[PDB]
C-alpha cells in the first residue's frame, strides 16, 4: 500500500511535547531559545494497513518518527544509503530485548524472521532493545525515530538519544498498530527555561518571521 489513512496528531500532541522536553535537556539553566530541527510534526501521520511480500515506500525525507497505538504483530523499517544502511526490526516480545543495525550490504524490504543482523558487514551499530520502556505494558507514551545526517545518525529511543558517528551518503528513500510521521523540513519551537520547569510552545507566525531560514 501507499500512505493510507492520513490523520493529524490531534489529542496526542503531548507526544511531541514530551519529545521536546527530552531534546531541550541540554540547554543552560537560564535561557530562552528557539530550537529548529527535523522535529516530529502534527499533520502527516499515517497508518497504512491495506501476505508478507508487500511493503510501503517513501521518498525524499530527512527524518522519520513513529508511534505505538494504545492484534500486535511486527514492524520493519529501512533507511537506504551508501555505504551504510539503517535497519530496525521489531519482535512480538514487547517486554524483552527489537534490534537496530547500521551496516554495509543490502537490507531486505520484508522480514519473516526476527532479531537478526546478517544483511551486511562492518557494522557500527548492533543494538538490542525492548519495544516498551522498562519492559512494561508504560508503552505508547513517547515517540521513536531517526534523523540521518551526513556526519552522524541520531536514534531516539525510550526518551534517550544514541548518536552514531560515521561519514555516509544518505538517500531519501525509506521502506516500511504502528503510526508513521515522515519529516521533510525544519520546525521551530520556543523553549523557556526561566520558570524552573521548561515550557515548550509553538513558533509559527510573528516570531517565526525572525527565526525561519
Ligand atoms: C501547536 O499547534 C498544534 C496545531 O498545529 C496544536 O495542536 C492542537 O492541540 C489541541 C489540544 O491538544 C488539539 O485538540 C488539536 O486537535 C490539535 N490540533 C492539531 C493537532 O492540529 C498544539 O496544541 C499547539 N501547541 C502549543 C504549545 O501551542
Ligand atoms: C495528507 O493531508 C494533507 C493536508 O492536511 C495533504 O497536504 C497531504 O498531501 C495528504 N497526504 C496524503 C498521502 O494523502
Ligand atoms: C523525557 O521526558 C519525559 C516527559 O517529560 C520524562 O518523564 C522522562 O523522565 C524524560 N526522560 C529522559 C530524561 O530521558
Ligand atoms: C511555572 O509557571 C506556572 C505559571 O504559569 C507556575 O504556577 C509554576 O509554579 C511554575 N513552575 C515552577 C517550577 O515554578
Amino acid at each position: 500500500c501507499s500512505k493510507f489513512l492520513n490523520r493529524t496528531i490531534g489529542n496526542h500532541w503531548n507526544l511531541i511535547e514530551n519529545f521536546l522536553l527530552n531534546y531541550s535537556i541540554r540547554l543552560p539553566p537560564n535561557s530562552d531559545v528557539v530550537l529548529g530541527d527535523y522535529f516530529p510534526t502534527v499533520q502527516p501521520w499515517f497508518n497504512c494497513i491495506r501476505n508478507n511480500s508487500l511493503y510501503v515506500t517513501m521518498e525524499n525525507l530527512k527524518a522519520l518518527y513513529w508511534d505505538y497505538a494504545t492484534h500486535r504483530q511486527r514492524l520493519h523499517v529501512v533507511v537506504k544509503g551508501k555505504p551504510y544502511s539503517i535497519t530496525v526490526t521489531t519482535t512480538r516480545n514487547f517486554d524483552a530485548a527489537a534490534i537496530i543495525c547500521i551496516c554495509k550490504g543490502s537490507p531486505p524490504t520484508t522480514t519473516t524472521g526476527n532479531l537478526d543482523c546478517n544483511w551486511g558487514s562492518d557494522c557500527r551499530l548492533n543494538h538490542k532493545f525492548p519495544i516498551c520502556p522498562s519492559n512494561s505494558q508504560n508503552c505508547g507514551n513517547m515517540l521513536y525515530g531517526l534523523q540521518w545526517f551526513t556526519d552522524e545518525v541520531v536514534a531516539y529511543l525510550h526518551g534517550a538519544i544514541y548518536r552514531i558517528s560515521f561519514e555516509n551518503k544518505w538517500f531519501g528513500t525509506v521502506t516500511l498498530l504502528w503510526w508513521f510521521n515522515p519529516v521533510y523540513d525544519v520546525t521551530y519551537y520556543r523553549v523557556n527555561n526561566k520558570n524552573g520547569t521548561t515550557i515548550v510552545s509553538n513558533c509559527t507566525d510573528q516570531c517565526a518571521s525572525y527565526v525561519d531560514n
Side-chain angles (χ1 to χ4, degrees), residues 19-23 25-30 33-40 42-48 54-58 60-69 73 75-84 86-88 92 96-105 107-108 113 115-120 122-126 128-130 132-133 137-150 153-161 163-164 166 168 170-176 178-193 195:
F19 186 89
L20 272 289
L21 261 270
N22 301 123
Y23 187 89
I25 290 168
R26 292 190 299 277
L27 296 176
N30 298 106
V33 301
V34 179
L35 307 179
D37 204 355
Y38 297 92
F39 287 116
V42 300
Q43 289 175 213
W45 286 86
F46 298 95
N47 185 10
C48 198
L54 278 73
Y55 55 88
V56 179
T57 60
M58 297 174 170
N60 297 324
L61 60 148
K62 294 181 175 180
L64 182 71
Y65 293 88
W66 59 93
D67 192 22
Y68 182 61
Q73 190 167 269
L75 174 66
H76 181 69
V77 179
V78 178
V79 180
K80 296 184 180 180
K82 183 172 74 171
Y84 294 95
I86 305 166
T87 299
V88 180
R92 298 192 79 206
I99 184 165
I100 180 166
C101 287
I102 302 175
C103 308
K104 293 174 65 175
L115 303 176
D116 202 8
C117 192
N118 289 297
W119 51 265
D122 200 21
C123 299
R124 298 296 299 278
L125 177 67
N126 185 339
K128 294 178 183 282
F129 62 95
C132 296
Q137 183 171 237
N138 314 156
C139 193
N141 295 118
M142 61 195 74
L143 303 176
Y144 301 146
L146 299 166
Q147 301 189 123
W148 47 90
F149 302 100
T150 299
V153 177
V154 38
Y156 296 83
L157 293 169
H158 316 102
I161 57 169
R163 305 185 82 87
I164 306 96
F166 60 94
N168 200 56
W170 295 106
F171 301 154
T173 298
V174 175
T175 299
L176 305 177
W178 297 94
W179 283 85
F180 282 84
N181 182 229
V183 179
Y184 302 93
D185 57 21
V186 174
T187 299
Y188 297 87
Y189 296 88
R190 183 176 294 276
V191 180
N192 183 333
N193 203 29
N195 196 41

Side-chain angles (χ1 to χ4, degrees), residues 3-4 6-7 43-46:
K3 295 186 283 288
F4 170 71
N6 193 14
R7 197 191 77 191
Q43 289 175 213
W45 286 86
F46 298 95

